[PDB]
UniProtKB/TrEMBL annotation, chains A, B, C, D:
Gene expressing this chain: dhaT
Group of enzyme by EC: oxidoreductase
Entry EC no(s): 1.1.1.202
Domain Fe-containing alcohol dehydrogenase-like C-terminal: 187-382
Protein name: 1,3-propanediol oxidoreductase
Entry keyword set: NAD, Oxidoreductase
InterPro entries documented for this protein: ADH_Fe/GldA (IPR001670), ADH_Fe_C (IPR056798), ADH_Fe_CS (IPR018211), Alcohol_dehydrogenase_Fe (IPR039697)
Length: 382, 382, 382, 382
């Protein structure tokens, strides 16, 4: 009946947006910055650019590149050792989801009483984190705009979530010039992740008109730009729109939550460490069809948003076109269409399905299923 | 080429969203609140609710209801004394635009070398304000979401603006249950203010895909709800949508700015002190038609968004329908169609145009004009 | 949010439906009947038919005919006097609106302590009335299916209403064979009265899907049958469908209430005592246009229900066609178009409008108006 | 040529409509209720709700929960024993069809001398029953609004029906808040039972425009909500709309009767004791195709009612779309499509056809068949 809508205070997007990193640290009060990034991204001009604007604005910088794909709690432990030994004032995360998830963890662990795993759950944080300037490199996760901090436990080998308004970065930066170097396959997976965020947020039980505003636009932008962005990575106009789309999808799903697509994709990531992007892609249209009966009117909307002609059609028929439209986009941009080829096996369906209902994202799915109905979705996508 | 996007960190909307004010002050550290409001709102059951939930969460309160319809520099001063003498920690603003502006001004003055004018202009603020929670009771202004602080200088009899990311409230609240008591004519005017925010933001030189997400949905929401809401204030559903519409329109124009409608409306409100909502409403269609040639494609979008059938028409014809649609909506809800009836006089046109050209809102208008062209628009609205 | 839906327990309709009056009096335990009717109807064949079947089933009868157009309170006294002296067990009403109100009044006065006017208002009745078998003769009022009883207070001159589930007749009878003799003007007026019941109930604040089932079908029936009915009274099919329409519109309005049409129609009957049917008729399209902004979507349904082609149209344009259709039907059947022609004076509007805003039927109107706005509608129908 | 139309005097529906059970028992003169229910419903909150409001209203209550799915005469015996032993005044049934038929049966046995099977047939009852308040729990049977009481003869093992106006419950209550807990499969089967009531009544020999009004809206509502209701039972709007739909389908079929779908369903219920709703659903599209030639116009209507596009089509082609729309809905909600999978045997068809031809509902079917043809329908549904 009532909703909250969280989003970073100050956000920057457009080509050359990276040029504000240094300036926005001066305004936040940051003297020294912990730059949190990947081993991969650290050798060209991505971390190098923010590193240039940081020293230009007179901000000292100790870097932490020890962030694994799937951010670990020991990554926060080792990361916090730098923040404390080098005495950093501000956190600058640069990369995809992983650097962002880790920078927040460091912010939490540096500000909240010893240990890290104990603060898992809802609004359970007491004191403000150190300022975080999250410069985002991927048109997919939108973590730079999210309330969510998800790390992986070393002890239990199971991920945990910390959901707090205090995890909202102080400033977000989305510069498409930093994204040009993404290989086609990667821009496709991150692109479908963004799509998945948009439709799941659009059809979520927690969907509202304010959230819809962002989700609808994201779906539209993705449908007009994802193909062209994977076609030619140097296409700036396409990159820009993909960047805005992903940021919009984030503003949406941060406040409306997701559904079964992520609930199932996290399991594929759990058992096979399949890339989160592709896991969402191959499942999307199968879960979307399953969700269809829950709100065919909004699926009719999705079709229209994706460019489909909808004129003389019953709502159910227009809804159908949304499914087709999603699989057409999926097939055009290279996405593998069957789990059979991603290494997945049929015996792991019951376990994954069981886990999927227990996943945090399942609660907001428009259709309340069971373990058998989820196993049938997997088999349809196999 | 580059864009910023500012929005309050944490936002609440939906029926009964007032119930979080006390809890939200607790999380921001506020021990004693300054309640900034109107004499007319100060009794019934609207500021008593925010006074109730603040009392149940254990926050002490000093009320300042000395806010004028056009927030004055002396209103900030007098309210600051109450902030200082009663020793308040946090600012709760309840009402429409006036309490929110005056609230921000109080926040500024309590934090920056005492003076009004001294800090007018762009990013001129150095220090964080006291936390501000803003409860909005009007589906019109969106000042609870805005970076602007507009006061009037009694020394010069002319208004001034302060623009800062620090003016952004800590929390915004949009409870449609509070708005229900709004009389028909008032909701007609406030609706059109929002409508004006949405289209000016959408066609603005500073518009972008992200900005546009909010503007578009707001036009769709207003086109579908404003009529219903002026017909029957107790219609909760229409009240809900108007609140989101006004809020989204705020997320749009806060970051894409406005244009000639507001530039011209402030002049009507500067002389005949015409209600801001009605000044926008009466001028909207005429400034729309003027701006048409700057972006026909986006005016075609507006027609579509307002529910018009565009199927076989040329862009220009479709643009025409957006103007028609706006004036139909304007007439339906009871807006006076001619400035002549609002006591406006033709001899004042030249001077009004001159001022409009200088107004801060003039720069972002998609069509660059002169005094003669602006004067002629007035003539078309007489 | 919660709704009641009242209707007689047993209802008969169709050609020769009258053939059950006797049998149904037997089943209710009535040994002797009070026949409550008009002087006009009481000789020819109409109360004679009902008389024949009462005799055939062994029920002896005493008849009361002193019912005025607009049933007086004294009419009830005179009816109760016959009810007691003749020792009556059951009450059979035959006629239009009046004999039904008078019948119910007698029923009330016979079972509740000696005085009539004192029982005005909502659920004020404690005791069951004698069984009432209501045989309807006009495709207009639907009083045979209604919880209301409305008599004129002879001492004050003003009408009063007793609203109770205990006013529902035991059995209703709607035999179209009994309506064949109605003059064209009478069938036009009663038909418009039925259409009014239907549209006001459809757009009422108290409307719901159960209620709308009856109203939608009644509008559809009237659109396809009223012209045919006024053109030729001996047309059995047209009389059948009008009889069913009127009954359905009763089932609707009894439970969703009415609106500004009826609140204004009663005032025209209050001063010039215009026939209720024609008053509603001349007001309908004008009050409808005023109500449009409250619910354009439902007015768009009305256009469709009435046989208009809505295909390419925006909702508003579709809603327009509902007004057009109504006034087309009005004109076709010979309803007078201007109040001026019915001896209505302009200086009576301020009083009438004031009185109309207080009428019981005004609270359920979808648009909340006032003195001036309702006066404006009068001037439009002038 | 002449029609009766029976329905409870007073009906409540909408969220929280249960809150009137106690108040309504007071007005019917009831001092001590016999709560007639299932062991299942009887703990949680639904007979608890009616118990709460009964006791709050000062009504004492004895409870009989020995009602079987397929209520036996011996249940009525046992229920009646409690009615008399505990000195009960009024009967309150809460549940689906079972508690209602059993509640009616007890009411009959309480006022009608000797046995049960004796009173089987039409208007065979002479005495009024004790007042009956019926609180409905299922959007399916609509027995709370019906003239029928069907029990099972334990001596003969076959079923019997008592059809009477006196079987009409005094008050029906339809609170969708009480229907939320129904598992997906049940709401689907009860929904399709409602659908079957609506289409059979629409196309029955005994159909008329009063009856059709309720039938049409029930079809429209079911086509717009059943998919949503089975997808998420906590969907309040879909629950409301299904509840109003079932009620309307009841008001329709109670008066227009049913046809071959029910005639054949009862035999599946007889032999395999298949759930009524699923037996109906699996048969609907095949019986509908068989009945098509009796009335292609109304199937064309049914197609349009279920949202199908009929614009270009011949009546026959439009009618075809109704059959497809029915089966599409059935599959969408996970209804089993083949009797082969319900444990049905082929050489039971001859016996089932014989019995279907003798069933009470067979008479009003718009197509007169024989044993071969009915058997041939079973074969198509196999
Ligand atoms: Fe994701
Ligand atoms: Fe404004
Ligand atoms: Fe009337
Ligand atoms: Fe049934």
């Amino acid at each position: 009946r009532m909703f909250d809508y969280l989003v970073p205070n100050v956000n920057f997007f457009g080509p050359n947006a990276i040029s504000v990193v240094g300036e926005r640290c001066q305004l936040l009060g940051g003297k020294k910055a912990l730059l949190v990034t990947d081993k991969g991204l650290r050798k060209d001009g991505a971390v190098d650019k923010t590193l240039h604007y940081l020293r230009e604005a007179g901000i000292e910088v100790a870097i932490f590149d020890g962030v694994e794909p799937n951010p670990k709690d020991t990554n926060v432990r080792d990361g916090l050792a730098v923040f404390r030994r080098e005495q950093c004032d501000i956190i600058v995360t640069v990369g995809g989801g992983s650097p962002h998830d880790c920078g927040k963890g460091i912010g939490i662990a540096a500000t909240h009483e010893g240990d890290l795993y104990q603060y898992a759950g809802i609004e359970t944080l007491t004191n403000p984190l150190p300022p975080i300037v999250a410069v985002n490199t991927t048109a997919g996760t939108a973590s730079e705009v999210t309330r969510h901090c998800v790390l992986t436990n070393t002890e239990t080998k199971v991920k945990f979530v910390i959901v707090s308004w205090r995890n909202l970065p102080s400033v977000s930066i989305n510069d498409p010039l930093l994204m040009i170097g993404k290989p086609a396959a990667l821009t496709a997976a991150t692109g479908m992740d963004a799509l998945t965020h948009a439709v799941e947020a659009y059809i979520s039980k927690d969907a509202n008109p304010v959230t819809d505003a962002a989700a609808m636009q994201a779906i539209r932008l993705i449908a007009r730009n994802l193909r062209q962005a994977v076609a030619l990575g140097s296409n700036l106009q396409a990159r820009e729109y993909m960047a805005y789309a992903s940021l919009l999808a984030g503003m949406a799903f941060n406040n409306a939550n997701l559904g079964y697509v992520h609930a199932m994709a996290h399991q594929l990531g759990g058992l096979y460490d399949m890339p989160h992007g592709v896991a969402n892609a191959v499942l999307l249209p199968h879960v979307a069809r399953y969700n269809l009966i829950a709100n065919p009117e909004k699926f009719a909307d999705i079709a229209e948003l994706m460019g489909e002609n909808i004129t003389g059609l019953s709502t159910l028929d227009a809804a159908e076109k949304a499914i087709a439209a999603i699989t057409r986009l999926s097939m055009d941009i290279g996405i593998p269409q069957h789990l059979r080829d991603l290494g997945v096996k049929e015996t792991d369906f019951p376990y994954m399905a069981e886990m999927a209902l227990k996943d945090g994202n399942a609660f907001s799915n428009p259709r309340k299923g069971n373990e058998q109905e989820i196993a049938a979705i997997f088999r349809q996508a196999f």
